[PDB]
Amino acid sequence: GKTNDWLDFDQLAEEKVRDALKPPS
Amino acid sequence: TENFTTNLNQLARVGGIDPLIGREKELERAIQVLCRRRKNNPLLVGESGVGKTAIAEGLAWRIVQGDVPEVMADCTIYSLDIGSLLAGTKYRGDFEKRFKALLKQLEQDTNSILFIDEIHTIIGAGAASGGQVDAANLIKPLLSSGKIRVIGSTTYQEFSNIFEKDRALARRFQKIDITEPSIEETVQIINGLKPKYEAHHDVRYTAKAVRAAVELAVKYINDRHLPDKAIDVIDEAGARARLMPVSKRKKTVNVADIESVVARIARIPEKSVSQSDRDTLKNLGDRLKMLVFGQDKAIEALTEAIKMARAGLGHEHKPVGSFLFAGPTGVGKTEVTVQLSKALGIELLRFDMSEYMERHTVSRLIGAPPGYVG
Amino acid sequence: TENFTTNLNQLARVGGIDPLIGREKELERAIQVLCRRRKNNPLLVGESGVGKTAIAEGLAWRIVQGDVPEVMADCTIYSLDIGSLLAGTKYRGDFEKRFKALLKQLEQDTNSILFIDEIHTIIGAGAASGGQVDAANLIKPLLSSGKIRVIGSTTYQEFSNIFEKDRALARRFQKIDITEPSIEETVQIINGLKPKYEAHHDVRYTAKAVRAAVELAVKYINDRHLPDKAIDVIDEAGARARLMPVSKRKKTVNVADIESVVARIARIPEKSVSQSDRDTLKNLGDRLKMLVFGQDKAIEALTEAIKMARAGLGHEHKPVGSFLFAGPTGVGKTEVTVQLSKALGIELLRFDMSEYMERHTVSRLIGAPPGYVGFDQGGLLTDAVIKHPHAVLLLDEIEKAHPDVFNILLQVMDNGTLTDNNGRKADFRNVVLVMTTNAGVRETERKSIGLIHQDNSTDAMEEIKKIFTPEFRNRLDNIIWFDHLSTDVIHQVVDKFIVELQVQLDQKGVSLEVSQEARNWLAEKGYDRAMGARPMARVIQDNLKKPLANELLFGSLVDGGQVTVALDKEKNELTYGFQSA
Numbered sequence: 001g002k003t004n005d006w007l008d009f010d011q012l013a014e015e016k017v018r019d020a021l022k023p024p025s
Numbered sequence: 026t027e028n029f030t031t032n033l034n035q036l037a038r039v040g041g042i043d044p045l046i047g048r049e050k051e052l053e054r055a056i057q058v059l060c061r062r063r064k065n066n067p068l069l070v071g072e073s074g075v076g077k078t079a080i081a082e083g084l085a086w087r088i089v090q091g092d093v094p095e096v097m098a099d100c101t102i103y104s105l106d107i108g109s110l111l112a113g114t115k116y117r118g119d120f121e122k123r124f125k126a127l128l129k130q131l132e133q134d135t136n137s138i139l140f141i142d143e144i145h146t147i148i149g150a151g152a153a154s155g156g157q158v159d160a161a162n163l164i165k166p167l168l169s170s171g172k173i174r175v176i177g178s179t180t181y182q183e184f185s186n187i188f189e190k191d192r193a194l195a196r197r198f199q200k201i202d203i204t205e206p207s208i209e210e211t212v213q214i215i216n217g218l219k220p221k222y223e224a225h226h227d228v229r230y231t232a233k234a235v236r237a238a239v240e241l242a243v244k245y246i247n248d249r250h251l252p253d254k255a256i257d258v259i260d261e262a263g264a265r266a267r268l269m270p271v272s273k274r275k276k277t278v279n280v281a282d283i284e285s286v287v288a289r290i291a292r293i294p295e296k297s298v299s300q301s302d303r304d305t306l307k308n309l310g311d312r313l314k315m316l317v318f319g320q321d322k323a324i325e326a327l328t329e330a331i332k333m334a335r336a337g338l339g340h341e342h343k344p345v346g347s348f349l350f351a352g353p354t355g356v357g358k359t360e361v362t363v364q365l366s367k368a369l370g371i372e373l374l375r376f377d378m379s380e381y382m383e384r385h386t387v388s389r390l391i392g393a394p395p396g397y398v399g
Numbered sequence: 400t401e402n403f404t405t406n407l408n409q410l411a412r413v414g415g416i417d418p419l420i421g422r423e424k425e426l427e428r429a430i431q432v433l434c435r436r437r438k439n440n441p442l443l444v445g446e447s448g449v450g451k452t453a454i455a456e457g458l459a460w461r462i463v464q465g466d467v468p469e470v471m472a473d474c475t476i477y478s479l480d481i482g483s484l485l486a487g488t489k490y491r492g493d494f495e496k497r498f499k500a501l502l503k504q505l506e507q508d509t510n511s512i513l514f515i516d517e518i519h520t521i522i523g524a525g526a527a528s529g530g531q532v533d534a535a536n537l538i539k540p541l542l543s544s545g546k547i548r549v550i551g552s553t554t555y556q557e558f559s560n561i562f563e564k565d566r567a568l569a570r571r572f573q574k575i576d577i578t579e580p581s582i583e584e585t586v587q588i589i590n591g592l593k594p595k596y597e598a599h600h601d602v603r604y605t606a607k608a609v610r611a612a613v614e615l616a617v618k619y620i621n622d623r624h625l626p627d628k629a630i631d632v633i634d635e636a637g638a639r640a641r642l643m644p645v646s647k648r649k650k651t652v653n654v655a656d657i658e659s660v661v662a663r664i665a666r667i668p669e670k671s672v673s674q675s676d677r678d679t680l681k682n683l684g685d686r687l688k689m690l691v692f693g694q695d696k697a698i699e700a701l702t703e704a705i706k707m708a709r710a711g712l713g714h715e716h717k718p719v720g721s722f723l724f725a726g727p728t729g730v731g732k733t734e735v736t737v738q739l740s741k742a743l744g745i746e747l748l749r750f751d752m753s754e755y756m757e758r759h760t761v762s763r764l765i766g767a768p769p770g771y772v773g774f775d776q777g778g779l780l781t782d783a784v785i786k787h788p789h790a791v792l793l794l795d796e797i798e799k800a801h802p803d804v805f806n807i808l809l810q811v812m813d814n815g816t817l818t819d820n821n822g823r824k825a826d827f828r829n830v831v832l833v834m835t836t837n838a839g840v841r842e843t844e845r846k847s848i849g850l851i852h853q854d855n856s857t858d859a860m861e862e863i864k865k866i867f868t869p870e871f872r873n874r875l876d877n878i879i880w881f882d883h884l885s886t887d888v889i890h891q892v893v894d895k896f897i898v899e900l901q902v903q904l905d906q907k908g909v910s911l912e913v914s915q916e917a918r919n920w921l922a923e924k925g926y927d928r929a930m931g932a933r934p935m936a937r938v939i940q941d942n943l944k945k946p947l948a949n950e951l952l953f954g955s956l957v958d959g960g961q962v963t964v965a966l967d968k969e970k971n972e973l974t975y976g977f978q979s980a
């Protein structure tokens with residue numbers, strides 16, 4: 001027959017961001 | 026806490042939750058798990074439409090009726106909303122403060138049993154780029170101790186792909202396997218739910234119609250489970266009766282309406298063939314012979330097979346007809362088939378087998394196996 | 400700081416801390432690490448349910464009890480809560496203040512130990528947008544200096560995937576590997592914890608029941624570790640007695656109760672089969688014989704194999720039965736299997752092996768390896784058996800599949816387990832494997848080039864040997880050769896098909912009557928030894944269904960009416976009486 005070619009599945013990292021407050025006075 | 030969670034018990038009194046029919050065996054093991062000293066957090070793993078949310082929500086409804094055990098009585102179920110918990114949590118600690126407050130409330134109550142639907146989501150709750158602090162990690166100390174009881178409902182694919190990977194959380198939750206009920210059990214469910222559907226649509230379903238929907242949907246409709254399958258034919262049939270007969274809308278919903286709805290959902294000829302369709306079947310042979318002269322035997326085999334299928338004498342689990350047309354070139358082997366589709370107004374799925382000349386070409390018809398290109 | 404941490408010593412004194420039985424060597428190593436001059440931060444790496452938390456919390460129990468070394472006496476163990484520390488740290492630096500303030504308390508005491516369960520969480524903490532400062536970084540200087548001692552508990556997956564990545568933090572923590580206890584060790588643990596569970600449920604557990612739970616769970620449950628796995632059966636068992644009405648009976652928890660709990664947890668048939676199941680099982684063969692005629696040998700193998708499994712004489716690790724139904728076309732190779740599941744009320748896992756004709760198609764069964772497009776989908780065979788452990792696995796047309804696919808079944812037939820791509824281990828102990836094959840059909844159809852014909856039946860047996868390797872054939876319980884349908888059985892087949900036609904007509908209100916002479920005529924016209932029962936439907940379809948279908952749609956039969964079929968000897972042609980009525 002013919003050769004069998006496999007395909008990979010790239011996975012990209014994803015992140016979120018938190019926030020820090022600071023009272024003016 | 027009131028914003029993030031909703032009291033299912035309160036909804037039951039006002040009719041928010043539908044009645045729960047049967048499922049005594051599934052519920053019997055659910056109270057035993059909840060009564061456990063530790064890890065008293067029952068999980069409900071089953072396919073879509075089996076009734077997982079019906080059993081968790083139904084438990085609250087059953088508590089109002091008073092048919093639950095004494096232990097379950099005086100308990101209030103709370104349905105956690107993940108979106109509300111993670112809403113406006115941009116500042117660090119809002120998610121933890123809200124989640125910790127909820128856990129403290131449940132522990133203080135000593136009788137409230139949380140219900141987290143689609144529990145796979147908490148594994149991927151609020152976190153930073155490298156932050157591993159999630160609801161699953163926070164709730165783990167309490168689940169093992171047994172201070173709080175948490176009901177969960179997730180599909181088999183989600184459970185294995187996501188929930189199972191987190192062995193620590195999976196250990197705390199005791200899986201309860203839910204399977205689609207029998208045909209006799211499904212009709213009982215529809216009868217229990219029939220008043221709610223009848224009131225909304227202002228129609229009345231006959232006993233024959235309900236039974237027909239369950240039996241007809243199991244056979245004709247596929248890729249959908251039995252509780253959802255039957256309920257879809259009941260809900261959809263009610264709507265049709267309400268809007269189509271604008272003048273003096275038919276109150277009753279006969280078996281004929283159920284058959285028509287199943288045909289649309291499954292895109293197959295409806296049972297109890299109509300007069301217009303009947304004329305086509307008797308004149309099919311004559312029409313085909315005019316287009317394709319000679320080869321009367323071929324037309325007789327195709328037309329007779331179609332008549333039996335529509336008549337209801339067709340094979341239960343085999344195609345309408347499998348025919349091999351072997352003959353000389355130019356005798357109309359393919360013309361009799363192309364014209365047949367035109368006469369019946371059905372799509373012609375013409376697959377040329379010249380392309381599939383080697384074994385490797387089989388992957389094109391059925392698809393490539395997982396992990397390979399295409 | 401009291402809000403953030405819980406005093407385990409005080410907790411154990413009043414209510415209980417789930418005391419630790421044994422683990423003397425594990426505790427000794429942990430105590431040794433705590434006594435170290437530097438990096439005295441013992442870590443507890445082990446599988447889920449091994450008892451890591453019990454060891455750390457159990458240390459507090461022993462300290463209050465006094466059965467600990469003098470150096471460790473008068474020591475306070477505090478269990479840190481990560482959520483409490485970060486609950487209100489909205490403002491910048493609030494988390495650092497609380498964490499730093501808490502650490503100072505430990506240094507001042509000099510005899511205080513901190514227990515951080517799920518220690519992987521501290522690695523990422525208090526990082527709002529880009530902050531690299533976290534509990535791990537803040538605690539790192541103190542750990543190296545050895546001023547404070549912090550016990551840790553983490554799973555192998557969590558440790559390697561996240562904790563090991565932090566090389567600096569890992570260096571400070573001296574890993575202590577916790578290993579699953581033995582059967583004897585687990586019963587001792589249950590006995591020590593038996594009073595707590597008994598008081599909760601007001602039940603009692605016999606010594607035999609405790610031993611049965613550990614042994615039975617190990618055999619049928621293989622997704623959890625032994626300490627929790629055994630305790631799960633003991634806990635749920637007590638609830639059953641409590642749930643059942645006190646008026647009828649609530650005395651103790653016997654071996655029978657333990658078997659029922661294990662059966663539901665594992666979704667396997669309950670031992671000590673009920674009378675209802677026994678009645679179905681004894682008459683299973685007779686019911687199958689009614690549906691399938693002339694294949695009694697095949698039915699005997701399936702019914703006897705199932706009987707042995709329920710009786711308790713089944714294979715310890717192999718499936719209920721590995722049967723290769725090799726026979727000619729249309730001899731009932733799959734009718735019995737399809738009707739066996741219906742009679743037993745179990746799901747039928749039907750897999751067509753014609754699809755698996757290529758070597759690369761093995762991924763469909765066990766799933767794609769990690770890092771590929773189909774890793775999420777999983778294996779169709781492993782997923783199906785996991786959902787339905789007690790079922791019938793029908794691999795139709797196995798010979799058509801590639802020889803490589805047969806190798807996958809070797810472990811299934813021998814060890815009753817197949818590993819998925821993810822690594823989950825399926826259980827085939829309760830699965831009735833049935834591999835139907837049509838090998839030798841062409842050989843039998845072939846005619847010998849000789850004056851006298853030959854017994855081609857033996858030729859098909861040799862072909863089986865070539866197609867299947869000896870190891871595969873040896874694992875099979877027995878190869879059942881389905882004999883060609885005889886003339887006598889064919890008559891019963893015609894009656895079976897006619898009955899099916901009556902069911903279809905019953906829905907439309909039509910009743911079909913077929914004289915005995917008419918049935919024989921149909922059988923003789925369409926009786927083919929090679930083709931089998933299938934041509935019977937073709938003659939019935941053309942003779943019975945075809946005239947009835949024209950009338951049903953364009954005749955008297957539209958409205959349900961009885962019809963009589965009779966044979967005309969003069970013309971040797973069936974006569975149909977519509978009887979419009």
Ligand SMILES: Nc1ncnc2c1ncn2[C@@H]1O[C@H](COP(=O)(O)OP(=O)(O)OP(O)(O)=S)[C@@H](O)[C@H]1O
Binds near residue numbers: 048
């Ligand atoms: N035992 C039951 N009694 C009454 N209604 C039921 C029962 N089981 C299922 N239903 C109904 O069947 C439909 C689907 O069941 P649900 O429990 O809502 O499904 P689900 O578990 O949310 O499905 P997903 O989201 O696909 S996993 C609803 O109308 C339910 O009320």
Ligand SMILES: Nc1ncnc2c1ncn2[C@@H]1O[C@H](COP(=O)(O)OP(=O)(O)OP(O)(O)=S)[C@@H](O)[C@H]1O
Binds near residue numbers: 354
């Ligand atoms: N029996 C027939 N009656 C009328 N027209 C015919 C007949 N057979 C062939 N034709 C004409 O010939 C055209 C082409 O015939 P085809 O469908 O190619 O024949 P075929 O024997 O099915 O071909 P193959 O599959 O290539 S051997 C039709 O579209 C008609 O125009």
Ligand SMILES: Nc1ncnc2c1ncn2[C@@H]1O[C@H](COP(=O)(O)OP(=O)(O)OP(O)(O)=S)[C@@H](O)[C@H]1O
Binds near residue numbers: 196421446450453
């Ligand atoms: N030697 C032991 N003595 C007493 N109880 C034990 C022992 N080993 C384990 N346990 C039980 O184990 C449970 C608490 O620890 P486990 O859940 O086994 O482990 P764990 O490390 O806390 O698990 P996670 O949270 O899933 S990493 C309780 O049921 C304990 O009684």
Ligand SMILES: Nc1ncnc2c1ncn2[C@@H]1O[C@H](COP(=O)(O)OP(=O)(O)OP(O)(O)=S)[C@@H](O)[C@H]1O
Binds near residue numbers: 693728837
């Ligand atoms: N002994 C039998 N009793 C009743 N029906 C039978 C019998 N043998 C075959 N059949 C019919 O066989 C049809 C289904 O085909 P099977 O018997 O499952 O085929 P098979 O023996 O697996 O051969 P292949 O593999 O399909 S060539 C049904 O219509 C059955 O009624």
Ligand SMILES: [Mg+2]
Binds near residue numbers: 077078142178
């Ligand atoms: Mg749901």
Ligand SMILES: [Mg+2]
Binds near residue numbers: 359
């Ligand atoms: Mg052509």
Ligand SMILES: [Mg+2]
Binds near residue numbers: 452
């Ligand atoms: Mg733990």
Ligand SMILES: [Mg+2]
Binds near residue numbers: 732733795835
């Ligand atoms: Mg077959």
